[PDB]
Amino acid sequence: YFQGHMMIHAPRRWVERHKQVQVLPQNAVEKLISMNELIELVIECGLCDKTSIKKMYDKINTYQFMWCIVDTIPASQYAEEIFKSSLHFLCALFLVDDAVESYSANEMQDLSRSYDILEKEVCKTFPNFPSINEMKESLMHLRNPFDRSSITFCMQYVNKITAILLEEGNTPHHVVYNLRRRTSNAISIAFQAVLIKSKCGSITSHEMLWRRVFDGLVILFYQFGELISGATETAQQHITVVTELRMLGCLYCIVINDLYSYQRDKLASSDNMIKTWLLEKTVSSLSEATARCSQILDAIMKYMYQRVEQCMQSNPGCPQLESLLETTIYTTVGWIRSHTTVVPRYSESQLKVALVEVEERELPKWLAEKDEYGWNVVEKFVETLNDEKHKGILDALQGIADGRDQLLKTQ
Structure with a gap:
């Protein structure tokens, strides 16, 4: 601990994959960044104009952000289309978030109601889906065109990934169905969480975790x-x-x-965890909030390592699973990289990170150096995750249920 006191830890083999550059020609960076297609898509919907998406693209640097969020180079044309649509969805999802953060309760209520009804309308036309203008028809009764455009864009992504995985024979049918349900349920649960933000609780530092997890749509990433x-x-x-x-x-x-x-x-507003701590349970602000966050992040890394390196040992002979788990690890570690270099948060009055590389001789020590508050935080987070009250949320974030969130945080 020193004046660069965001010191976190991550295994060396996890982080050596982020020291890596995208070996890819410029034909294939413009295949993937189809900026003209993004323009035509956002002006075919009612979202925004060319200037707005170009400003969001300059702000977020969505391409390098994506390379913090995938580790697998496209191996076929379908993978190229998937990466393209994912980039587009990321870029415009942030623009929707910039506007929905100041939505009244009635406006969010109508938005989430329309999403919930439209999902259930277009889930029975599977594998067929309506086009963008056909999908505006059921939303014509809304008083804000921005909500209509947002819903159409989100459901467009939801249907496009399905169309891609059914135009190939690689992925089985019935699991593509579950995947589509999983994606749309994630979006609907995000709307439900931002609508639950109309109340301020009837507070606890575990309800806080449960809400802040759902407040972002990182699962889609x-x-x-x-x-x-x-x-x-x-x-x-x-x-x-x-x-x-x-x-x-x-x-x-x-x-x-x-x-x-x-x-x-910019005022953090919201249910920012540092605000909640400093209201009650923090002495000096930044130096202690940073150490609490560092403990929580280190504990998440350790639990993720142990969980992966157990589920691989109890499910042996599954290389596909191994690569998938390594991809998840990559995308969890990439958020450090993203906040440090690729997002427009070049504050440097913000904490300057010190990302320590835990080497192999140190890994047994580091997985037994677990004597911290982050341990309790993550353990209780996992318990409230696997709580039977929250089984419906689990099954909805799996591809096996309908999305309902409002009966468990508002009650």
Whole structure:
């Protein structure tokens, strides 16, 4: 600990893959960055104009952000299309988030209601789907065109990935169905969480984790590596454990987000965890909040390592699973890289990270150096994750249920 006091830890073999550059020609970077297609897509929907998407693209640097979010280079044309649509979805999802953060309760209520009804309308036309203008028809009754455009764009992504995995014979039918349901349920649960943000609780530092995980749609970002690597079937043979690791990664990303955004001019507002701690249970602000966050992040890394290196030892002879788990690890570690270099958070008044590389001789020591508050945090997070009250949320974030979230955080 010194004045660069965001010191985290990650195994050397995990982080040596982020020291890596994208070996790829410029034909294939413009195949993947189909900027003209993004323009035509956002002006075929009612979202925004060319200037807005170009500004979002300059801000987010969505390509290098994507290379922090997938580790598998496209191996066929379908993978190229998947990466293209994922890039587009990321870029415009952030623009939708910039606007929905100041939505009244009624406006969000209508938005999430329309998503929930449209999902169930277009889930019975499977494998067929309506086009963008055909999908505006059921949303014509809305009083805000932005909600209509957002819903059409999200369901467009949801149907496009399905169309891609059914235009090839590699992924089985019935698991593509579960994948589609998983994606749309994630989006609907995000709307439900931002709608639950209309109340301020009737507080506890575990409800906080449960909400802050759902406040971001990071699961959809983890699914990019699944799709682009062709592991949809082997991730559907292991929907559990994979979903838990992705939840741990979401918690990781949101801890880092809440710590970066509390050092900005923009009011954090929301249920920023540092704010909640400093209201009650923190002495000096930044130095102690940073150490709490570092403990939580290190504990998430250790639990992820142990879980992966157990599920591989108890499921031997499954190389596809191994590569999938390594991809999830890559995407969980990539959030450090993203917050440090590729997002427009070049504050440097923000904590300067010290990413320590845990070598092999140190790995047994480091996995037994678990005597911290982050241990309790992550353990209790895993318990409330596998709580039977929250079984419906689990099954909805798996591809095996309908999305319902409002009866478990508002009650």
